[PDB]
């Protein structure tokens, strides 16, 4: 139908993991992009985890220094950050970001620049991609586009998937059978829309997951 296909395109439309890369660099554990033109570092802090996202067209940078509390008591929508979490979120120009991020910003810069060198040769980012990227031609997000970030990363020790939790309360399993398993949660811990998003661009709804993949993902998250 149409109501479904339009509701599906809405689900496919926001910030999702487009690609990511783990490292052997020590400062950043993971580079990623959730929105065209925006490149993030997911990194350890003395007390836990932090992240930052650089928009390469505007050179404005989201900085989330602490993601170690899951409080969803953010009353009002932040004007530039799509997040339902109470944690402090900062928007900085690139040079203020450099002062606080150091090697992390350098790392993001080298990630961006390598991607651009590859693109100049017609080659994609050297990174693990999701099974599907909405608006594949899109190279930059409109200016007023709110920033989203990665909050949690759960890689399968056996390499079969990675689970991501995002600041917009979306969850995304990227796995090795040419589909993602995606869903939207709310703040009272309910799950709304959820789909197998297939490499052919199709999306199949499910209620309970019969594939066994989520049951295995679940065990990894609890460990």
> CB–CB of 160/216 below 8 Å?
yes
Q: How far apart are CA 57 and CA 77, in angstroms?
A: 24
Rounded to the nearest angstrom, the gap between the alpha carbon of residue 67 and the centroid of all alpha carbons in its chain is: 14
Question: For residues 205, 74, 28 and 153, what is the CA-based torsion angle, rounded to 10 degrees?
Answer: -30
Would you list the domain boundaries of the chain?
A: 2-222
Reported resolution in A? 2.2
DSSP structural state of residue 81: B
Q: How far apart are CA 219 and CA 214, in angstroms?
A: 9
Q: How far apart are CA 33 and CA 129, in angstroms?
A: 10
> CB–CB of 61/94 below 8 Å?
yes
Half-sphere exposure of 39 (CA within 13 A, CB side): 25
Question: For residues 49, 220, 149 and 198, what is the CA-based torsion angle, rounded to 10 degrees?
Answer: 160
DSSP structural state of residue 174: E
Technique of determination? X-ray
Q: How far apart are CA 115 and CA 24, in angstroms?
A: 18
């Amino acid at each position: 139908e149409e109501q479904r296909m339009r509701f599906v395109d809405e689900f496919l439309s926001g910030a999702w993991v487009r690609f990511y890369s783990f490292t052997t660099d020590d400062v950043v554990a993971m580079y990623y992009s959730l929105q065209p033109g925006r490149y993030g570092a997911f990194f350890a802090t003395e007390q836990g985890v932090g992240t930052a996202v650089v928009d390469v067209h505007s050179k404005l940078v989201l900085y989330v220094p602490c993601m170690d509390k899951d409080s969803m008591n953010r009353i009002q929508p932040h004007p530039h950050v799509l997040t339902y979490f109470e944690e402090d979120v900062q928007l900085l120009n690139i040079s203020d970001a450099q002062k606080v991020l150091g090697s992390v910003l350098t790392g993001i810069m080298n990630f961006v620049q390598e991607i651009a060198r590859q693109r100049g040769e017609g080659l994609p980012p050297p990174a693990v991609h999701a099974a599907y990227l909405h608006e594949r031609d899109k190279t930059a997000v409109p200016s007023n586009t709110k920033f989203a970030y990665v909050r949690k990363v759960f890689p399968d020790p056996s390499g079969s998937f990675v689970l991501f939790r995002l600041s917009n309360l979306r969850s995304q399993v990227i796995c090795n059978v040419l589909m993602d398993i995606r869903w939207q949660s709310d703040r009272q811990n309910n799950v709304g829309q959820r789909y197998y998003v297939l490499a052919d661009g199709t999306a199949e709804p499910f209620t309970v997951d019969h594939t066994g993949i989520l049951f295995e993902v679940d065990q990894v998250v609890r460990n």
